[PDB]
Design an enzyme around this catalytic site. Structure first.
Site, PDB file in Angstrom:
ATOM      1  CB  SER A 214      40.491  41.829  36.913  1.00  0.00           C
ATOM      2  OG  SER A 214      39.079  41.677  36.683  1.00  0.00           O
ATOM      3  CD  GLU A 347      40.955  47.116  30.860  1.00  0.00           C
ATOM      4  OE1 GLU A 347      41.855  47.612  31.479  1.00  0.00           O
ATOM      5  OE2 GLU A 347      40.551  45.892  31.025  1.00  0.00           O
ATOM      6  CG  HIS A 467      40.057  42.706  31.645  1.00  0.00           C
ATOM      7  ND1 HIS A 467      40.453  43.652  32.546  1.00  0.00           N
ATOM      8  CD2 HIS A 467      39.563  41.682  32.372  1.00  0.00           C
ATOM      9  CE1 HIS A 467      40.235  43.209  33.771  1.00  0.00           C
ATOM     10  NE2 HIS A 467      39.691  42.018  33.699  1.00  0.00           N
TER      11      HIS A 467
END
Length: 566
Positions: A214, A347, A467
Site C-alpha cells: 500500500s 482489493e 487489501h
C-alpha cells in the site's frame, strides 16, 4: 472498532508482552555501525526458530524542535555500545484500535534481523517499508514480526519514517525550507544507512531488495523513481500500490494553513506566519486535527489524505520528487531493475465497513463522475465530458439496474489499484533497459490466521481477499498463532516468503524448491502483450490471464482523446 474488539486487543497486547519475554534469550551480540556499536539479542519464534534482533537503530537526528518539518539530518555518533534490545517509539499517529494519539516525534529508527550474523556468503538484504496511508504504521514486532522470513537465509530490515503532517507538510515559500516529503527523505537516509551498514550484519550491499504494501509500495516505487537513490538497491516489489495511484500523491501546500486554522491560528494565509504557529504546536494536537483538514469538495473528489507525498515547489539538494510521478517514470533508474508487482483478488473489499456506515456512497455509481481520473475531470464534476467518462466507468462496474455495494467495491479495486498499475506498466515499458517485471495476484482466503488491519476494518467473517490480507503470510503479528505444518495457512507462509526470498536473491520469482510450482511457467510481462499474465496464488499456484483485464482496458479507453496523459 467496537468495544468487544477493543477488549480483545487489550488482552492480546498483554499476552504479547508475556510471549515476548518468553522468547527473549540471553545471547546478546554486538555489531558495528558507522555511528557506533549496537547491542542486540537472539530471540526465538513459536516455530522454534531463532534470529538476531537489533531494534532502535537511529539513522537520522531526532527531528524535534527546529528540525520539525525539515529534511532529516545524520545522527550523532556514540563511542560506547547502544542498547538495541528494545523497540523505540512509533511516529506520532492516531492509534486505529484505541482512537487516541500515540507515538513520538523521536521516531527515525530501523530494525535489523537475521538468523546468522556470520554467514559464509553475504546474504540478500530485504528492506520492508510499511504502509498505512503515510499516516499510520510502525516497525514494531507486534505488527511486523520477522519470524517467518528468518526461516530463510536473508537479512530483513524494517524501517520507520515520519507520518502525517509531521512527515508531509509542504510550503511554497523557498525561504522556509519546508518543500515537502520529509518522510520520503527519511526513507532515503534509511536506504543510505542500509547500503553503508548491511555488511556488518552479513548482508550483501550489492543485493538489496526494497518492498512495501500500500503506502509502503508507493514508497518503494518513489525510492525507485528518485535520483537520490540511484543504484542503492537491486530489486523492487510493489504490493498493492505504486506512485501513480490517486491516493499516493497530493498537492497539499494550502493545507498547512487549513490545519493551523483548526488548531487556533489567527492571521493571514502566509507561509511564514503559518509555519511559525505550527512550529510551536504540540505534536499530538496537530495529529489529532489531521482527520478534519480535507474539505467536503476534496473528499468528494477522492483525495484520501490531507498530507502526503507531493511534487516539491522548488528544488533543493535533498529534493526527492521534483516532478509528477508519471514524468519521473520517464527517466527513472529503477525502471532498470527486476521488479515484481501485484494486488489481491478483491482489493476494495476493504471498504465493507465504510459502505455500512455511509450507505449513500453507493449513489455515487449512478453517474460515477467522482471516480473519473482527476486530470481529466473538473473539480465540480458537472462538465459533460466528465459525465461521459463516468458513464464508461459505470459500464465497467454496475452489473444490473441498480448500483450495489459490491459494484462500489469492485470499482474501488480498479480506481485505487489495478488501473494505476496498468498505467505504470505501460509507461515503464517505454523507458526501461528491458529488465523483467513479474505479476502476482494474491487470492488465498482464510479466517484461521489474520492481521490487525482486519480488526481496523471490522472485517472479521467477511469472505474474500481484501487489501492487506496478504500481510498475514509475510509477517508475524500479535494476533497470530503457531499453525500446523500441514495447514493451508502454513503452506501459504512458506510459499509467500519463499517467492519473495527467491526474487530477492535472483531477480526471478520462480523456484522448483517452492512447493506447488512444478507446472508454473512464470514469464515476465512484455511490451507486446495485450493481456497480462499473473501467478494467481490460492490453494494452488496457477498462471492465468489477469481476470481484471477487461475492466482495465475500459478504464484506459477514457484516455482515447488524451493519450499523452495515459
Amino acid at each position: 472498532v467496537s468495544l468487544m474488539e477493543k477488549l480483545k486487543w487489550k488482552i492480546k497486547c498483554i499476552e504479547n508482552k508475556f510471549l515476548n519475554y518468553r522468547l527473549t534469550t540471553n545471547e546478546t551480540v554486538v555489531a558495528e555501525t558507522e555511528y557506533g556499536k549496537v547491542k542486540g539479542v537472539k530471540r526465538l519464534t513459536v516455530y522454534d526458530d531463532s534470529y538476531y534482533s537489533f531494534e532502535g537503530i537511529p539513522y537520522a537526528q531526532p527531528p524535534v524542535g527546529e528540525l520539525r518539518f525539515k529534511a532529516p539530518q545524520r545522527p550523532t555518533p556514540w563511542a560506547g555500545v547502544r542498547d538495541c534490545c528494545n523497540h523505540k517509539d512509533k511516529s506520532v499517529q492516531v492509534d486505529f484500535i484505541t482512537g487516541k494519539v500515540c507515538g513520538s516525534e523521536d521516531c527515525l529508527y530501523l530494525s535489523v534481523y537475521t538468523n546468522n550474523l556470520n554467514p559464509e556468503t553475504k546474504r540478500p538484504v530485504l528492506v520492508y517499508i510499511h504502509g498505512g496511508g503515510f499516516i499510520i504504521g510502525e516497525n514494531h514486532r507486534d505488527m511486523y514480526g520477522p519470524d517467518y522470513f528468518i526461516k530463510k537465509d536473508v537479512v530483513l530490515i524494517n524501517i520507520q519514517y515520519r507520518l502525517g503532517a509531521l512527515g508531509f507538510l509542504s510550503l511554497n515559500s523557498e525561504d522556509l525550507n519546508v518543500p515537502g516529503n520529509a518522510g520520503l527523505k527519511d526513507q532515503v537516509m534509511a536506504l543510505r544507512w542500509i547500503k553503508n551498514n548491511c555488511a556488518n550484519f552479513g548482508g550483501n550491499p550489492d543485493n538489496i531488495t526494497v518492498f512495501g504494501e500500500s503506502a509502503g509500495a508507493a514508497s518503494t516505487h518513489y525510492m525507485m523513481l528518485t535520483e537520490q537513490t540511484r543504484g542503492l538497491f537491486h530489486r523492487g516489489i510493489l504490493m498493492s500500490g505504486n506512485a501513480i495511484c490517486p491516493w499516493a500523491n497530493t498537492q497539499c501546500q494550502h493545507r498547512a494553513f487549513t490545519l493551523a486554522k483548526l488548531a487556533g491560528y489567527k492571521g493571514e494565509d502566509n507561509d511564514k506566519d503559518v509555519l511559525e504557529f505550527l512550529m510551536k504546536a504540540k505534536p499530538q494536537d496537530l495529529i489529532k486535527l489531521e482527520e478534519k483538514v480535507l474539505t467536503l469538495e476534496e473528499r468528494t473528489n477522492k483525495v484520501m489524505f490531507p498530507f502526503g507525498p507531493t511534487v516539491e515547489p522548488y528544488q533543493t539538494a535533498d529534493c526527492v520528487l521534483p516532478k509528477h510521478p508519471r514524468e519521473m517514470v520517464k527517466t527513472a533508474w529503477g525502471n532498470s531493475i527486476p521488479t515484481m508487482m501485484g494486488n489481491t483478488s478483491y482489493e476494495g473489499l476493504f471498504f465493507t465497513s465504510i459502505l455500512k456506515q455511509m450507505p449513500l456512497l453507493v449513489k455515487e455509481l449512478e453517474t460515477c463522475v467522482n471516480f473519473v481520473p482527476s486530470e481529466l475531470a473538473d473539480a465540480e464534476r458537472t462538465a459533460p465530458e466528465t459525465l461521459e467518462m463516468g458513464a464508461k466507468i459505470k459500464k465497467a462496474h454496475v452489473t444490473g439496474e441498480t448500483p450495489t455495494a459490491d459494484n462500489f467495491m469492485d470499482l474501488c479495486s480498479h480506481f485505487y489499484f489495478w488501473f494505476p498499475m496498468h498505467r505504470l506498466l505501460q509507461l515503464r515499458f517505454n523507458h526501461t533497459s528491458g529488465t523483467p517485471v513479474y505479476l502476482y495476484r494474491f487470492d488465498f482466503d482464510s479466517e484461521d490466521l489474520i492481521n490487525p488491519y482486519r480488526i481496523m476494518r471490522s472485517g472479521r467473517g467477511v469472505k474474500g481477499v481484501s487489501h492487506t490480507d496478504e500481510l498475514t503470510y509475510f509477517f508475524w503479528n500479535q494476533l497470530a498463532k503457531r499453525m500446523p505444518k500441514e495447514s493451508r495457512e502454513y503452506k501459504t507462509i512458506e510459499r509467500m516468503t519463499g517467492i519473495w526470498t527467491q526474487f530477492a536473491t535472483t531477480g526471478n520469482p520462480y523456484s522448483n524448491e517452492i512447493e506447488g510450482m512444478e507446472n508454473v511457467s512464470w514469464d515476465p510481462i512484455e511490451k507486446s502483450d495485450e493481456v497480462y499474465k499473473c501467478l494467481n496464488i490460492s490453494d494452488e499456484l496457477k498462471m492465468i490471464d489477469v481476470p481484471e483485464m477487461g475492466k482495465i482496458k475500459q478504464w484506459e479507453s477514457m484516455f482515447e482523446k488524451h493519450r499523452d496523459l495515459f
